[PDB]
Structures are given as structure tokens and as C-alpha cells.
Structure 1
């Protein structure tokens, strides 16, 4: 599909058995999802945004379906006002920027 940018490019994703709304984010190296009691082993990580760094839990090889497209990779969990799908998963669904 094609998504314009008049508004935030929010789409439905499925992770850990739950459906959530997430932002297709070309400005994010990583995928960060709002605090979720996700099971599995994790490693601590710090990621930086416009205002500074925040602590997140890094989970590997997590299946994540994006608008019906299956992906699997690293998902970071932490306090974020919006669920973010980063380039690590956007590449998996063959997403591009076009103009």
C-alpha cells in the first residue's frame, strides 16, 4: 500500500499476541513499543531521542506483523507515548520512501 504523510502514519501491528497501533518511522533506527509485559529474555539498552536517552529492554527475535506483513526481529520495550516501528522492521516489509 501507499501511505501519505498528511497525518502520522499509524498502522495496526500484532506483537506478543496483541494488536496495537504503531508509527511507521523512517527516523528511528530501532523499534520501540510502549511498556508491555512481554515474556522472554532481554538485555538492557539505552536509546536516544530528540530530548535525550531512555532505558529500554531489548528483546530479540520477536515476531511482529505490520499491516498483515510478517516480520521478526529486535523489539525494544519502554515508556514511549507512541509505539514506533523502526528501520530494522521497515526493511523487512520492503518499505521505501518515494518522491
Structure 2
């Protein structure tokens, strides 16, 4: 689709059997989701932004559907206040910025 920016670009995602909403975030290197259990093996990670840095759990080769577009890759889970879809997954679904 083509998404405009008058509101926050929150779209529907599906991950580990659950439906969520997530922000398509061209300013996020990585994908970061609110707390949730996800399969198996993780390795710690730190991410920073405005205000500071948080500890997250990194999970590799995770399947995630983003508005009907399936992608497999790295998902981080931790104390973010919004689910964020970062460039790691945006590249996979073919996402571009246009103006």
C-alpha cells in the first residue's frame, strides 16, 4: 500500500499467532516489540534512542506478517512502549519512502 504521514504509520502485524499493531519506522535500524514470549533461543542486546538505552532480547529468523507481507528475521523484545517495525524488516517487504 501507500501510507501517508498525517497520523502515525501504525499497521497490523501477526507474530507467533497473535495480532498486534506496529509502527513502520524508517528511523529504527531494528524491529522492536513490547514484551511477549517467542520461541526458543535469544541473546541479549542493547538499543538506544532519544532519552537513553534499554536492554532487549534478540530473536533470530522470526516469522512476522506486516499488513499481509510476510518476512523472516530478527525481532527484539523488551520495554518499548510501541511495537516498532524497523528497516531490517521494512527492506524485506519492499518498503520505500517517496516524496
Q: TM-score, with normalisation over the residues of structure 2?
A: 0.98
Q: CA deviation at 1:43?
A: 0.2
Q: What is the number of equivalent residue pairs in this alignment?
A: 99
Give ranges in structure 1 of 5+ residues lacking alignment. none
**What is the CA distance between 1:37 and its match in structure 2?**
1.5
Distance between the aligned counterparts of 1:56 and 1:5, measured in 2?
28
Distance 2:54 2:29 in 1: 14
Alpha-carbon offset, residue 42 of structure 1 = 0.1
Q: Return the alpha-carbon distance in structure 2 between the equivalents of residues 40 and 24 of structure 1.
A: 26
**CA deviation after TM superposition for structure 1 residue 39, in Å:** 2.3
Partner Cα distance (1:40, 1:11) in 2: 26
Q: What are structure 2's unaligned runs of at least 5 residues?
A: none
Runs (4 or more) in structure 1 with deviation over 2 Å come to none
User: Normalization by structure 1: what TM-score?
Assistant: 0.98
| Residue 6 of structure 1, CA deviation | 0.2
**Take 1:89 and 1:33, find their aligned partners in 2: how far apart are those partners?**
13
RMSD of Structure 2 on Structure 1 (CA): 0.5
Measure, in 2, the Cα distance between the counterparts of 1:85 and 1:23: 6
* Structure 1 stretch displaced more, 4-13 or 35-44: 35-44
